[PDB]
Amino acid sequence: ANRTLIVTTILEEPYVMYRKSDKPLYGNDRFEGYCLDLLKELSNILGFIYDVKLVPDGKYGAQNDKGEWNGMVKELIDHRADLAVAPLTITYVREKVIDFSKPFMTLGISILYRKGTPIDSADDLAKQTKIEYGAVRDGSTMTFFKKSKISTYEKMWAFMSSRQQTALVRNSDEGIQRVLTTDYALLMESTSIEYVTQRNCNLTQIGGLIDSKGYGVGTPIGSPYRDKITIAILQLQEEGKLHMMKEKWWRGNGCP
Template sequence: MNPLAVEIWLYVMAAYMVVSFTMFVMARFSQYEWNNQPHPCASTITTWWRTSQRQQRFWFITGTLLRQGSGLNPKAASTRIVGSIWWFFTLIIISSYTANLAAFLTVERTSTPIESAADLAKQEDIEYGTLEGGSTMTFFRDSKIETYQKMWKFMESRKPSVFVPNYEEGVQRVLKGNYAFLMESTLLDYIVQRNCNLTQVGGLLDSKGYGIAMPVGSPWRDKISLAILDLQEKGVIQMLYNKWWKDTGDVCSRDEKKKDSKASPLGIANIGGVFVVLLCGLSLAIVVAMLEFCWNSRKNAQTDRQSLCSEMANELRFAVRCHAPPRRPALKRSCSRCQTTSATYVPPPPRAPPNGCELNLPRSVENGAARHRGSFGYDVNDCA
């Protein structure tokens, strides 16, 4: 559900209901949707409309939304406009959803390849080093931990050297890429907060405190220690840290950068225009449906030889009924091309010939054939 905002999902559901209902109503008003295919001239209409028409309209919208199609195809111009604009709507919605879904999956699966010092020790593609001659270098050199011993052997064996003479050069080497710089946490925190292209990976490798050196037996030792503890309990040290590390005015907005880098749900500002297009298409379809209704009522009025207002009232009365009968009264008209007759042609009996005239039968009758090719004739030769 994340690729689309909550309001977009609600609008899609509302559009689904509105389009389905609109197509259902238009189909009731349009005479073209009442054809009883494949027998358009059947004298009785089946219960197809009443039993399955409503479900078919919703099924058509559902199948189109899921790009599967439906067995029902609109016939009238108004319903075809609704179907076409709904196809366009679903094309944009599904394409936007698919594209943003890929973005969500990509962002969620993207992870930093190095999460800790152990990850650095397991690979050799990314080089890492420390300040040459510094306390961090001494820590790795004298460490008894297997992971840190392995890292020290790697740093010591690399040529050119991975050690840098100062912190500025180490930072620049990190910015060039494919290099990790191990440094003291206090200075690391200060630099990372001022350069959004840098990030701290993992926690502290070793923890050491800072102290103030004094002569042995100095009376200031206990006083300064108690003062530092008092400042820690009152939060003054944290306030000083925030003042000189975070609130100096040159700290980058890392939170906003992190927020922008994530995929966000699509809202009205992104795909709201497709809803406007859908409403415009529905409005056009309604106008076309009204024109179809008036045109069909006019033709039916001429056929039934009644006034246009009466015909429109009958059609409208039938269309707005919630529980329509299986047969539609407006379809009681018969189709001329379906009127057939089973009667066969029977020729009239022959008349008696005049006196002295010879009766000549057709050749087909003389041969005993059952077909009649024409009427009987008289041969007037030798007639008085």
């Protein structure tokens, strides 16, 4: 039999979540979400079974000054996992070190905050001095700011970095809690803003999308699975299955 593939992933609603049950759940059955449904589909098309393993350091992945990676990206570089199936952003810096499938979803960075402020854009947010802001540490949103040559975003990076231990949160849940309880706005991918703002009516998007990019399945460079995964993603795309999965996990509209 084909060796069981190791899948690295991360908890992120509604992609990967703990299933609620009154009885014990083991192995893959502990998890549900868009990315678990994606895995069920891809594995049917490619002919494998898999073992879902949450990334030990709880990070998506960024590189330090020494060029060392962490998170799911590191798991792939180091051949600890065969695939990363998660809301994993396809980026230039990552594509140089891992192989991504074609995208299965598109999105862009935007701002999550509470309601009732005059802040209407990143420019407004960077300029004002009442509300703090940040991003999840060691994800692509942090990296977008770190790498930006756009003045507003350079200032925003310098601010986030100056108070990093502070402004950069461990994960999206900590970020959302910080938005709800303190004067802090979270730079967040739009598909997650769409999800949370239809569930918590105290939350809102500020401004539009600041960029546009995709999520892809990650594999180590040279993986004999990447092309097969790409072909399967295109099948699911064209058959309307990715759209159906999005509707399933985001439905419906809960806030004015």
